[PDB]
């Protein structure tokens, strides 16, 4: 039906969560949500621009992508992180390494790297931009990936072209054709996957978000075996990310068509869904939770709510501050 917000999933597990979201909203007589299934942010971005879906949550890198032509989607609601007592609409891109090593951020040449994915904020845009000075990139037409592939001995950059940049997919753990996939079929995909790539010892550094280590390692003693590479070339505890990060970046956000995008219905849905199924709100459904073996389905597991984006704020403006 027309009045229902059509959400776009990028995997089957997300589709399954969306359908559960749909029946739960229906049970509590809240705003209706329907589900559309795709395989990547790009297919969801396109599907929305083509009125086949209405909304999707994207990392900063794809919020950028979605704002260009022929899509022109804009962020309508940002994820909120931190705590209810201290909420924030931004997180931190950090460089996590194993304690015991002596190399600093300016000494990564020849080492192995783990990234959340190609063109993702913390996993790529931020770290690569930060390391530019150390690369020997000759600018266009040479794709930046080529320079990165010459810098790190090997890496796992989900979504990178295994054909042109084999080095960038070498450390990835996906089976057969799924090796280096920009999806959960690749064990080292996204935040937790990139961190696992470090935990397993495949890589020497993981470019992820500051909350990853805390979500994945409950034991304080285990987390103490990791530290962060600070921009001033020093190492510090994973809990000191505020004084040791590569960048502070805007939170992932739900995007929608800039014209006739059902913005008000989308916000009504998010506000009520947050209230009914947000953190510690319901035993039957968790808008911000994912089943065992799954991470950040539809929204980050670390999200605690939403913040509506003021009108006439396009992708460009959202990301630039
Ligand atoms: Fe991100």
With beta carbons less than 8 A apart as the criterion, state whether 184 and 110 touch: no
Q: Any residues with CB less than 8 A from the CB of 224 and at least 6 apart, and which?
A: 99, 237
Helices (H), 184-262: 190-199, 212-216, 220-223
Q: Are 3-80+253-315 and 81-252+316-321 the same fold in CATH?
A: yes
Q: Is 122 annotated as a binding residue?
A: yes
Q: Tell me the CA–centroid distance for residue 84 and ligand 1, in Å.
A: 20
Spell out the domain ranges in the chain.
3-80+253-315, 81-252+316-321
Q: Any residues with CB less than 8 A from the CB of 273 and at least 6 apart, and which?
A: 21, 25, 30, 31, 33, 287
- Mark the residues whose beta carbon lies below 5 A from ion ligand 1: 59, 121
Q: Is 93 annotated as a binding residue?
A: no
Q: How far apart are CA 171 and CA 247, in angstroms?
A: 25
Q: Tell me the CA–centroid distance for residue 117 and ligand 1, in Å.
A: 9
Q: What angle do CA 152, 154, 155 make, to 5 degrees?
A: 95
Resolution in angstroms, to 1 decimal, for this deposition? Answer: 2.0
Q: Is 159 annotated as a binding residue?
A: no
Q: How far apart are CA 176 and CA 24, in angstroms?
A: 37
Q: Which CATH number fits domain 3-80+253-315: 3.40.50.150, 3.40.190.10, 3.40.50.720, 3.40.50.300?
A: 3.40.190.10
Q: Is 66 annotated as a binding residue?
A: no
What the block records as the tokens of 214 is: 């805390």
Q: Tell me the CA–centroid distance for residue 120 and ligand 1, in Å.
A: 6
Q: Is the peptide bond before 173 cis (omega within 30 degrees of 0)?
A: no
Catalytic residue list: 72, 258
The length of the chain is 321
Q: Is 202 annotated as a binding residue?
A: no
With beta carbons less than 8 A apart as the criterion, state whether 73 and 315 touch: yes
What the block records as the tokens of 230 is: 């600070």
Q: Is 95 annotated as a binding residue?
A: no
With beta carbons less than 8 A apart as the criterion, state whether 235 and 118 touch: no
Q: How many CA atoms lie within 13 A of 115 on its CB side?
A: 32
What's the N-to-C CA distance of the chain in angstroms? 37
Q: Tell me the CA–centroid distance for residue 252 and ligand 1, in Å.
A: 6
Residue (of 237, 202, 36) closest to 115 by Cα position:
202
Q: How far apart are CA 92 and CA 95, in angstroms?
A: 10
Q: Tell me the CA–centroid distance for residue 82 and ligand 1, in Å.
A: 15
Q: Any residues with CB less than 8 A from the CB of 244 and at least 6 apart, and which?
A: 94, 228, 229, 230, 231, 234, 236
CATH superfamily, region 81-252+316-321: Periplasmic binding protein-like II (3.40.190.10)
Exposure of 286 by Cβ count < 10 A (0-12 exposed, 13-18 middle, 19+ buried)? buried
| Method of structure determination | X-ray
Element (H, E) at 320: none
Q: How far apart are CA 52 and CA 314, in angstroms?
A: 21
Q: Tell me the CA–centroid distance for residue 37 and ligand 1, in Å.
A: 21
């Amino acid at each position: 039906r027309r009045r229902s917000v059509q959400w776009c999933a990028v995997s089957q597990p997300e589709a399954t969560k969306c359908f559960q979201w749909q029946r739960n909203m229906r049970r509590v007589r809240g705003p209706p949500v329907s589900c559309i299934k795709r395989d990547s942010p790009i297919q969801c971005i396109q599907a929305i621009a083509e009125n086949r879906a209405d909304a999707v949550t994207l990392d900063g890198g794809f919020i950028y992508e979605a704002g260009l032509a022929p899509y022109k989607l804009r962020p309508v609601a940002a994820e909120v992180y931190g705590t209810e007592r201290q909420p924030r609409t931004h997180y931190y891109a950090v460089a996590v390494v194993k304690k015991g090593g002596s190399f600093q951020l300016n000494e990564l040449q020849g080492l192995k790297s783990c990234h959340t994915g190609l063109r993702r904020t913390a996993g790529w845009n931020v770290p690569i931009g930060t390391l530019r000075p150390f690369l020997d990139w000759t600018g266009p037409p040479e794709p930046i990936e080529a320079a990165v592939a010459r810098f790190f001995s090997a890496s796992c950059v989900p979504g990178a072209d295994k054909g042109q940049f084999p080095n960038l997919c070498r450390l990835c753990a996906g089976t057969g054709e799924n090796k280096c996939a920009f999806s959960s079929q690749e064990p080292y995909f996204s935040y937790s996957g990139a961190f696992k790539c470090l935990r397993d010892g495949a890589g020497d550094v993981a470019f992820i978000g500051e909350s990853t280590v805390f979500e994945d390692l409950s034991d304080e003693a285990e987390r103490d075996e990791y530290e962060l590479l600070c921009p001033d070339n020093t190492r510090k505890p994973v809990d000191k990310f505020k004084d040791c990060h590569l960048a502070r970046v805007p939170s992932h956000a739900v995007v929608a068509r800039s014209v006739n995008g059902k913005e008000d219905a989308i916000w009504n849905l998010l506000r009520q869904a947050q209230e009914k199924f947000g953190k510690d709100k319901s035993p039957k459904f968790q808008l911000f939770g994912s089943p065992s073996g799954q991470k950040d389905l539809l929204f980050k597991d670390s999200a605690i709510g939403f913040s509506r984006v003021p009108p006439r704020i396009d992708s460009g403006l959202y990301l630039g501050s």
